[PDB]
Swiss-Prot record, chains A, B, C:
It comes from the Bacteria. Signal peptide: none annotated. GO terms for biological process: chaperone cofactor-dependent protein refolding; protein folding; protein refolding; response to heat; response to radiation; virion assembly. The gene is groEL. It catalyses: ATP + H2O + a folded polypeptide = ADP + phosphate + an unfolded polypeptide. Its EC number is 5.6.1.7. This is Chaperonin GroEL. Phosphorylated reversibly during heat shock. Each subunit is composed of an apical domain that binds non-folded proteins and GroES, an intermediate domain and an equatorial domain that binds ATP and is involved in inter-ring interactions. Forms a large central channel that appears to traverse the entire length of the cylinder with no obstruction. The central channel of GroEL functions as two cavities, one in each ring, that are separated from each other by the crystallographically disordered 23-amino-acid C-terminal segments of the seven subunits. The entry and exit of polypeptide seem to be restricted to the apical end of each ring. Modulating the volume of the GroEL central cavity affects folding speed in accordance with confinement theory. Small proteins fold more rapidly as the size of the cage is gradually reduced to a point where restriction in space slows folding dramatically. For larger proteins, either expanding or reducing cage volume decelerate folding. A stepwise reduction in cage size results in a gradual loss of cell viability. Transmembrane segments: none annotated.
């Protein structure tokens, strides 16, 4: 279709405008004094929220070029979301600040490539220095503290997460499920988790977590690619009965078959989700088997001349619950018998003995750990379905934050970590003056989060920014009480990982937009 | 429908505007400091690319005449791409440069035909001069160097390519496949490659390479054209079982049959790809047999009263893997037994003895080389599926570039080769003044690539151009470091083949546009 | 009337647009290869000029804000013109260069006050550096050389000027008049020149020189202010007869009387011009008397109870010719008798003896020097009225240039002086980054003159600028022959005074525009 094509500054003003509409809508919701954003709905009362992600997903602009700018930033923020699980508003505010001054520098005649290089050098040095501000979170006491703080001061949620990590290790798998009613429950079941997400959205039955969740489903373990639905027809119907959902763990589910699954499960016609088998090559088959041994299923490989048509509900594996993200599948409590499972473990355990290569050794140890590690499960307390569903949400978030904190620690919140780091980089220089402008653009943007938080309070950004910059260490501004103090002692913490991610993703998009010379989009016809 | 018709100048300004929009969008991506171009998508985030071809594909204009000019010059990139697989952006800026000055000369009253003749003469001599400057890439050391340079300084990839060419010769067939995991693998198998691509896209299952790849497929060797699907029905079903893809190597697959194959394999209903048989006439049949002997199949020719209906999976040939490009089919590791194959070789070997004509002699030697040469297979190292898939890409590109280098050598990159050539042609003249202007148009356009590379750096084109022209030999401008020096010593080389192709296709399309007097298109209604 | 009021950016873009129209129209006329500009006339053929001042005078824009910007920068040329009588085009291109980059920096957010401070510092140091590079023009050989060069290599005009200055001193008064025919004439007459211009234009009968010229006029020396025309009526009529013009040298001619004089002399009704009396206070009267003694007139002061009504043509002084500029009156050849004049000299000469103060002593020596110095008169050769009128023009210009050269020396022309100065200031810095940007804005603007000269040649500005900057000293580009060489040896020189003035006035007006925040003008109604 005929295209509209814009160059240089023409494209620049358009991108900046789109970015500003997105960032301005989103940023009003940052921090304890975040304001409400009303999102219209075709049916019912409008949604009223302080959650930046919800606001962002609704942002689409009429002007084609402006919409492109908006969509570009949305992407990165969501990426920060995927990587750290928090800080999308922070990232969006950092991105607007870098893009705004960067595009201005470009209109001023500065070399885009150099501006980008300066920005990148500042970020690289900045994340390194952010580590110096970090407070580790290794012992259970620390884990408990972070969890409590992340759970709105609920020392209960804190103890739960700490105990859970104490069971399966802070690097282990942990899940949360509705409780049986009153009093929490923590138990380790036979489970496993591999790096493979849904073969397409839609399967996502819980957009709240943007994941797919199945209860007591059957697990088809096909050691091959599935293109023709015909092969599935027999098994899909066998599963149609028994009224249980089906999880497809094949080498891959291609267009034809996948398309059908997406349409059928879209019409309530049998609930089925598909994900690729873990690993590739040889180890793939070996791993697909570990899953079988765990779920009590039977691998259907063509190597042994087996057909999916000739597959009954007896071949299928089974587990009490399975959850799959954008890129992760977790099987909770499989039917497999400890006899077969523990035996399988013994086998692989000898494999490691006969290992003649570190690589093969590592890969084997990975399997035993997965098959012998299990899955810690947290069943949230209760006393009414409403409160139970609520506390469950808190435990979910607290857990998420604590996990990030365990990986890279926590730093002062309220935007002080980033501003503290920027205030110590004023002497940083690059190869030339344009690169030096880039560095300054970056150091300046690092103050935007704190500034927006204060602005949302109804206070003066520059005055508070100044005062914070004047102190040192964790000295900062508490936006909830409007008093200065030690951010760590006041319990205003951000996982180091989310702060670093927000900055790197913001810088990354900004760098791309700053070095964009031409935009192509459909004509507004 | 009713047409809009434009003549001379009216048509010229339209064409020029159309080529300018396309060329301007494309040329910003040229070189190490190429800028980003954002391409809108109907869903999700826009595409951000520094790839010229990707930009060109999206260019379509509203004004019917301007669109014609854009689509015409777009042919330059596509042909240069098909012929050399690189240098499409370079070819596009050369075309714009030639078209711009050429149309100006026409508007000035100069004879279009003479202008074109002059341009052609300059290009003819320029190509000869380009060959003269070309540095060979014959020994394994040179091959290793080029490979390393093309692999982003990865001396590993360099060694691999060098060893692969040492096995099957620099003219031999070489492929790259995913590795078994960690450490590369190089092995020669029974294989062959002939000049015939897919009989239509869609068969392309891997758009990343725009090629078709089949694993352990059956190979139908039919010595005749296939129009009716009926004939295939019996064999297609036999192949439906055993769950293996099918490669059709017939004299040709016409509409009816082809259309069906495209639709069926489009629905996952049996994976089948079709390509014409190598050569034509008599040699065609002899060659179709060489493939049979290699894949252990049986030629199904009507000459012996054979029917496709009466063809079983036993007649079909087979190989571990086959890959087909837009114009190349490569069969890797065929089932044929060394007894039959090596025997077939002996036969053709005598054919050469009894050869009473050089032509027949050449053609025969070509067959023995293909059948006795084999196929070197490069299995890329690993250590995680992600890195493995990445390194595979690099090896593929490095191989492609090194192959080109071996054919015609290499010349200084950064646009300096064309500048040196242009300076050597300063005294070139034609039959008249208009032809002389055409020659000058071409020599001037030869500086465009270096000038655009510099412009993208944010430096001054005329100053750098002036300085490079000031020195000589491999003296050029390194746009990555913004330092002058010896292009070869700095490792900035271009295969002579891509430079030559870019120039010839640019001059070719430019010549046509310059000699265009009238344009016809549908009325904007 | 109602006003239109604009602020910041809105006002800025308007001013920039206005200076760009003016500067672009003017700068095309710069240097040896300056282009022609056609200026429409209400009647007859249009004016075709390469004179920057002629072009600037015609520039007026429709948009009220754009017009203001144009008229403001137009002040640059006029002031530089009044100060050095040359380099108005150079001054305009320097102003546009400073304004353009300065307004960009303002739009980029830099502090306007600091940008101006940085620009001002750079110009201050640049002027000092300019004086350091200046070569003196003190001896008659140098004076002859400069004159020759300024007269288009006419060694004749060079000798004439050298001799004239040798007569009355290089600081003495010199005039040029039509010759009697063939062969030049140099003689000194009883004359004097004081710092007082016409009390209003209109009196200007020769717009070519923008000055007023009277031949054999009567000189009224009234020692008081004249407000009522009544007083003049009697004398004006006495002068109405004898058919001679009248020069009014009173303490001042105020509104009423002045207005009448402007109207009457506007209708050919008696030619009269008025100028204030030299000096002020006491010395004023004494000086007004020196003029009387020189012109043979009689001071009409009220102190002795004298009335202008009772003044006859006998009281009026007289001289063969008088010329008055915007701020200078020169009486050439007065009627006064050498007896009275030389006697008056003796008087003042004793005054100097009895002087008890240096100040009084200096002031007295100034008077004797004026009254005893006379006025050198150069009568241009001939051989046909046409050639005579021409040579006269050259002598006038060569004289003007040589005068400037004597005052401050000469520097390489072709814009190389400013380029050499700029390079010597590469390390100049201010109090902060914004001031440093200002400094760079100024150093960059200094290359504008040379670049525009090259541009008008049809050559590449950056290439030539680069080459010139590459060399040093008087190495420069000769735009007439398009060859590099020693500007001095090639005779391409500019009086340090015009280069200095162009730079200071440009920076002065640029600094004012850069620090303007609001513009007020009438509503376009
Ligand atoms: N009392 C407080 N004073 C100052 N800042 C606080 C306080 N409590 C929390 N914060 C900060 O507020 C920020 C988090 O606010 P949110 O509104 O959740 O936005 P976000 O995490 O950047 O993006 P979302 O949540 O993905 S939308 C972090 O910088 C917190 O440290
Ligand atoms: N450091 C360098 N300095 C100068 N030129 C370089 C450098 N590195 C690569 N080049 C040149 O850049 C050109 C290739 O740039 P590309 O952006 O890949 O465009 P292209 O190959 O013309 O078209 P594509 O790649 O098909 S879009 C060749 O002239 C290279 O020699
Ligand atoms: N052969 C030459 N090569 C280079 N520059 C020259 C040459 N001859 C004169 N110039 C320069 O041209 C400039 C003077 O050009 P003009 O066009 O007269 O403009 P201007 O004096 O700046 O303004 P006007 O004359 O008042 S409009 C000075 O910088 C001279 O040194
Ligand atoms: K919020
Ligand atoms: K590129
Ligand atoms: K001029
Ligand atoms: Mg948050
Ligand atoms: Mg390329
Ligand atoms: Mg001049």
């Amino acid at each position: 279709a005929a295209k509209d094509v814009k160059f240089g500054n023409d494209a620049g003003v358009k991108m900046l405008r789109g970015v500003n509409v997105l960032a301005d809508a989103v940023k009003v919701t940052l921090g304890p004094k975040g304001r409400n954003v009303v999102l219209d709905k075709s049916f019912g009362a409008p949604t009223i929220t302080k959650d930046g992600v919800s606001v962002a997903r609704e942002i689409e602009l009429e002007d084609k070029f402006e919409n492109m700018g908006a969509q570009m930033v949305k992407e990165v923020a969501s990426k920060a979301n995927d990587a750290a699980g928090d800080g999308t508003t922070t990232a969006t505010v950092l991105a607007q600040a870098i893009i705004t001054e960067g595009l201005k520098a470009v209109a001023a005649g500065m070399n885009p490539m150099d501006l980008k290089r300066g920005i990148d050098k500042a970020v690289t040095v900045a994340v390194e220095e952010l580590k110096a501000l970090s407070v580790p979170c290794s012992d259970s006491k620390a884990i408990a503290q972070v969890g409590t703080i992340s759970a709105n001061s609920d020392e209960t949620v804190g103890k739960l997460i700490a105990e859970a990590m104490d069971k399966v290790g802070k690097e282990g798998v942990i899940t949360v499920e509705d409780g049986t009613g009153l009093q929490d429950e923590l138990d380790v079941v036979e489970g496993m988790q591999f790096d493979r997400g849904y073969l397409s959205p839609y399967f996502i039955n819980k957009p709240e977590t943007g994941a797919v969740e199945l209860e007591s489903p059957f697990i088809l373990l096909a050691d091959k690619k599935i293109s023709n639905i015909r092969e599935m027809l027999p098994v899909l119907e066998a599963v149609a009965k028994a009224g249980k959902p089906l999880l497809i763990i094949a080498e891959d589910v291609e267009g034809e078959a996948l398309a059908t699954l997406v349409v059928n499960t879209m019409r309530g016609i049998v609930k089925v989700a598909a994900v690729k088998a873990p690993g590739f090559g040889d180890r793939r088959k070996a791993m697909l088997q570990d899953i079988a041994t765990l779920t009590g299923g039977t691998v259907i490989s063509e190597e042994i001349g087996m057909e999916l048509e000739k597959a009954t509900l007896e071949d299928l594996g089974q587990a009490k619950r399975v959850v799959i993200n954008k890129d992760t599948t977790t099987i909770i409590d499989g039917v497999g018998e400890e006899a077969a499972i523990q035996g399988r473990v013994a086998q692989i355990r000898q494999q490691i003995e006969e290992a003649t290569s570190d690589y093969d050794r590592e890969k084997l140890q990975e399997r035993v750990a997965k098959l012998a590690g299990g899955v810690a499960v947290i069943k949230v307390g209760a006393a009414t379905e409403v409160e139970m569903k609520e506390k469950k949400a808190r435990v979910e978030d607290a857990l998420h934050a604590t996990r990030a904190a365990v990986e890279e620690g926590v730093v002062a919140g309220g935007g002080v970590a980033l501003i503290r780091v920027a205030s110590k980089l004023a002497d940083l220089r690059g190869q030339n003056a344009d690169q030096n402008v880039g560095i300054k653009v970056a150091l300046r943007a690092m103050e935007a989060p704190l500034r927006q938080i204060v602005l949302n309070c109804g206070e003066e950004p520059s005055v508070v920014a100044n005062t914070v910059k004047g102190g040192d260490g964790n000295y900062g501004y508490n936006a909830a009480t409007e008093e200065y103090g030690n951010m760590i002692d006041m319990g205003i913490l951000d996982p180091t990982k989310v702060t670093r991610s927000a900055l790197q993703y913001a810088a990354s998009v900004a760098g791309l937009m700053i070095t964009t010379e031409c935009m192509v989009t459909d004509l507004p016809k």
